[PDB]
Amino acid sequence: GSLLAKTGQAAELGGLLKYVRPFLNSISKAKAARLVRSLLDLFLDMEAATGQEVELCLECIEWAKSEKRTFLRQALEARLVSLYFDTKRYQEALHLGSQLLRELKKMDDKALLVEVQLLESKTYHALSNLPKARAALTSARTTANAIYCPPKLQATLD
Amino acid sequence: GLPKNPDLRIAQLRFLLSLPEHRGDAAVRDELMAAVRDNNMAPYYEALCKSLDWQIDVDLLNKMKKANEDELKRLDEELEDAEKNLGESEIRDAMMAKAEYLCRIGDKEGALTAFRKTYDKTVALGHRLDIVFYLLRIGLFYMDNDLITRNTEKAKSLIEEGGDWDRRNRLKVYQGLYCVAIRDFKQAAELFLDTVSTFTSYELMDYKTFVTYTVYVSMIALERPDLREKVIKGAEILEVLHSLPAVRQYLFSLYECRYSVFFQSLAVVEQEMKKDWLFAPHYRYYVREMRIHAYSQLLESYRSLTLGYMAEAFGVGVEFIDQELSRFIAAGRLHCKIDKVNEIVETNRPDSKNWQYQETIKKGDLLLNRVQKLSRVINM
Amino acid sequence: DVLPPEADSSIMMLTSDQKPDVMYADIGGMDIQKQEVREAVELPLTHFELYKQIGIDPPRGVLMYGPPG
Amino acid sequence: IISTHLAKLYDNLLEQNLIRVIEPFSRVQIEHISSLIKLSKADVERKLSQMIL
Amino acid sequence: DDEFEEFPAEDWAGLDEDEDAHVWEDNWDDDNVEDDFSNQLRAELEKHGY
Ligand SMILES: Nc1ncnc2c1ncn2[C@@H]1O[C@H](COP(=O)(O)OP(=O)(O)O)[C@@H](O)[C@H]1O
Numbered sequence: 001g002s003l004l005a006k007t008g009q010a011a012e013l014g015g016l017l018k019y020v021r022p023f024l025n026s027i028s029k030a031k032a033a034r035l036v037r038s039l040l041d042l043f044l045d046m047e048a049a050t051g052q053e054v055e056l057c058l059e060c061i062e063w064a065k066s067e068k069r070t071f072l073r074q075a076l077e078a079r080l081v082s083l084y085f086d087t088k089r090y091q092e093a094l095h096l097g098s099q100l101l102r103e104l105k106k107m108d109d110k111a112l113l114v115e116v117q118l119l120e121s122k123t124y125h126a127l128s129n130l131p132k133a134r135a136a137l138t139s140a141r142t143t144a145n146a147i148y149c150p151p152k153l154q155a156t157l158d
Numbered sequence: 159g160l161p162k163n164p165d166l167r168i169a170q171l172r173f174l175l176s177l178p179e180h181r182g183d184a185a186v187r188d189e190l191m192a193a194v195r196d197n198n199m200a201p202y203y204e205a206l207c208k209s210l211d212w213q214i215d216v217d218l219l220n221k222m223k224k225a226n227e228d229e230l231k232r233l234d235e236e237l238e239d240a241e242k243n244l245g246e247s248e249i250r251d252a253m254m255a256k257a258e259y260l261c262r263i264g265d266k267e268g269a270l271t272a273f274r275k276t277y278d279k280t281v282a283l284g285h286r287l288d289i290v291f292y293l294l295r296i297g298l299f300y301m302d303n304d305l306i307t308r309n310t311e312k313a314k315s316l317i318e319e320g321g322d323w324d325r326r327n328r329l330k331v332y333q334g335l336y337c338v339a340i341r342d343f344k345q346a347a348e349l350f351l352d353t354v355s356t357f358t359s360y361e362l363m364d365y366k367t368f369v370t371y372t373v374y375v376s377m378i379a380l381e382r383p384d385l386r387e388k389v390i391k392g393a394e395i396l397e398v399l400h401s402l403p404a405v406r407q408y409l410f411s412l413y414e415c416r417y418s419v420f421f422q423s424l425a426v427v428e429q430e431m432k433k434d435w436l437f438a439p440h441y442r443y444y445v446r447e448m449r450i451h452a453y454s455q456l457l458e459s460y461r462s463l464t465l466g467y468m469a470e471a472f473g474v475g476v477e478f479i480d481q482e483l484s485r486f487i488a489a490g491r492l493h494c495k496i497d498k499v500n501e502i503v504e505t506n507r508p509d510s511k512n513w514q515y516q517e518t519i520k521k522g523d524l525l526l527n528r529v530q531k532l533s534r535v536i537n538m
Numbered sequence: 539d540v541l542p543p544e545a546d547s548s549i550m551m552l553t554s555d556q557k558p559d560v561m562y563a564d565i566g567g568m569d570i571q572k573q574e575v576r577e578a579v580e581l582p583l584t585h586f587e588l589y590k591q592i593g594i595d596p597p598r599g600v601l602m603y604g605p606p607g
Numbered sequence: 608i609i610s611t612h613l614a615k616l617y618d619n620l621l622e623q624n625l626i627r628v629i630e631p632f633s634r635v636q637i638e639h640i641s642s643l644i645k646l647s648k649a650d651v652e653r654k655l656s657q658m659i660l
Numbered sequence: 661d662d663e664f665e666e667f668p669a670e671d672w673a674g675l676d677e678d679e680d681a682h683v684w685e686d687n688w689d690d691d692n693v694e695d696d697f698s699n700q701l702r703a704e705l706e707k708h709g710y
């Protein structure tokens with residue numbers, strides 16, 4: 001995956017991701033999930049196949065749901081909220097963020113909640129929704145008090 | 159409150175098939191697609207005018223209507239005969255089911271009868287609110303402006319006084335009376351900017367349609383004061399204009415006072431309002447009033463703007479703009495005069511003192527008429 | 539005559555309204571709780587109509603028995 | 608917050624230049640105003656309008 | 661109480677329809693007849709060439 005990212009390959013990386021699934025369902029859930037996240041991010045980095053990225057990640061989310069890896073599928077849902085904001089998606093990003101918030105507040109994840117709230121504030125600002133953006137950002141601060149030194153995340157919040 | 163909303167849709171489809179004959183091919187298709195469904199035989203005495211007397215579903219559809227209505231009637235007979243449930247009991251919701259059958263299936267007459275019956279029977283807060291809402295919805299369905307006025311009067315007078323946080327669920331259609339009528343200038347807006355919907359997408363066919371009504375009403379309402387801080391500042395407003403680009407297009411065109419795109423967008427707006435049953439200002443306040451406001455805004459802060467250049471700054475056809483200005487000056491607004499021998503627009507804007515003086519003398523005329531009438535009242 | 543003003547009769551502060559001194563989220567204390575305080579502002583934040591209908595009885599007196607912290 | 612703020616600042620400079628050059632004149636010709644501001648006529652007229660409306 | 665029928669009481673013999681059956685307030689201009697404005701603007705665009 002590192003060499004594929006260095007060269008800029010897309011089809012080979014997609015095939016490798018679609019192939020490594022048995023190895024994913026054979027090891028620690030957290031390690032496999034983070035490997036999946038890293039591979040997906042590296043694939044989405046360079047080659048901008050906007051007609052394929054969303055569909056591939058949605059297939060990955062459906063696969064994670066079938067594997068009952070709830071935190072994995074939630075992480076990819078947050079990643080697609082980020083990709084939706086990158087692609088200037090109007091309200092589908094919004095309802096995906098709302099669904100993520102509903103699924104996550106019942107849990108006690110914190111990094112995902114901060115990222116989701118920050119993305120919601122970002123998309124409110126993109127749609128020029130200033131008061132809801134302010135409310136979401138205040139909630140983002142209230143949630144982000146938890147992580148003490150997330151050096152990237154604190155810069156994002158600021 | 160979901161019922162009578164698809165009924166509103168079929169009513170608007172009948173409007174689009176009947177009043178504009180330009181829509182006579184796709185209008186037939188949508189009318190058929192929403193009338194072969196929804197059990198439209200009793201609500202087909204209105205549909206027979208445009209299409210055939212009855213579409214070819216007669217046997218099956220009438221059997222379905224009669225069977226469903228007979229089943230609900232049997233249920234109502236059981237509740238009202240075998241059981242003596244009175245007042246605060248389940249007979250109230252039984253008669254609500256009766257009215258729902260008579261409305262969503264049968265014609266409006268039986269629905270209105272069942273409504274008035276249970277309204278006179280039970281006067282509880284929740285029941286009364288629900289039935290007032292249903293009466294308003296069926297009135298705005300069948301375009302009985304008399305029924306709409308009646309239910310609006312009773313609700314705004316006493317029904318809404320008892321019980322709160324439901325007026326926020328009702329004003330959006332309680333102001334539909336002003337919406338469907340000509341009064342889209344002040345009252346409709348003042349009570350209609352409230353972005354608190356009783357349902358996410360219902361009543362007025364959508365939240366997007368709700369917003370389009372808001373935009374039309376505000377555009378009729380004012381021109382460009384701190385409207386930036388009244389509606390433009392609205393975050394939900396900006397979001398829904400992002401959802402609707404052309405709507406955002408003409409709204410921002412009016413706000414920016416760019417007439418070149420404004421007139422084309424305004425013609426598009428008038429065309430859209432034609433495809434809408436809320437077309438009461440067919441010749442007064444589609445485009446003529448909005449451009450009266452726009453021309454006032456333009457020629458104010460101006461003294462002598464040339465016709466030939468204001469024409470290209472406001473579209474094309476110098477003769478078209480000249481005749482429009484003449485017609486509107488004859489109408490009364492556009493406080494200015496036209497120097498035809500030199501083709502100039504010499505405005506006459508009164509000072510604050512002068513215009514307000516004129517307003518006071520007008521009101522003095524009206525009140526002298528009033529006091530003369532009252533002097534007639536006395537000494538007789 | 540009856541004197542209309544009442545606050546300056548004995549001073550004791552006055553209308554600290556219409557003035558942003560410290561807005562809200564700018565506070566450094568985050569919450570402590572602050573949820574019972576948003577609860578206390580619910581009544582100023584309209585919601586007196588929603589106190590009824592729902593059947594709740596909104597709080598009236600809020601004592602904070604804390605040190606200058 | 609790049610194009611929007613740059614446009615806002617540009618409007619600020621336009622308004623400040625016009626207000627700074629406008630005090631002496633009880634009535635001034637707008638092409639002279641445009642000459643002082645070093646711009647065309649239509650844009651200067653549009654800005655002065657949007658200010659005064 | 662009398663209706664003053666001595667003055668010629670020619671009641672309106674239509675009894676067919678109220679043209680403004682609703683609360684709409686008309687204006688002297690509102691009742692002019694034209695092809696609204698959309699068609700007129702289309703004709704203007706055509707005569708100017710676009
Ligand atoms: N962001 C902040 N968060 C918490 N306390 C603050 C903040 N900013 C200022 N303060 C301090 O809070 C203090 C209020 O203290 P004080 O009113 O005397 O306590 P008490 O209300 O118990 O008498 C002020 O003196 C001020 O210095």
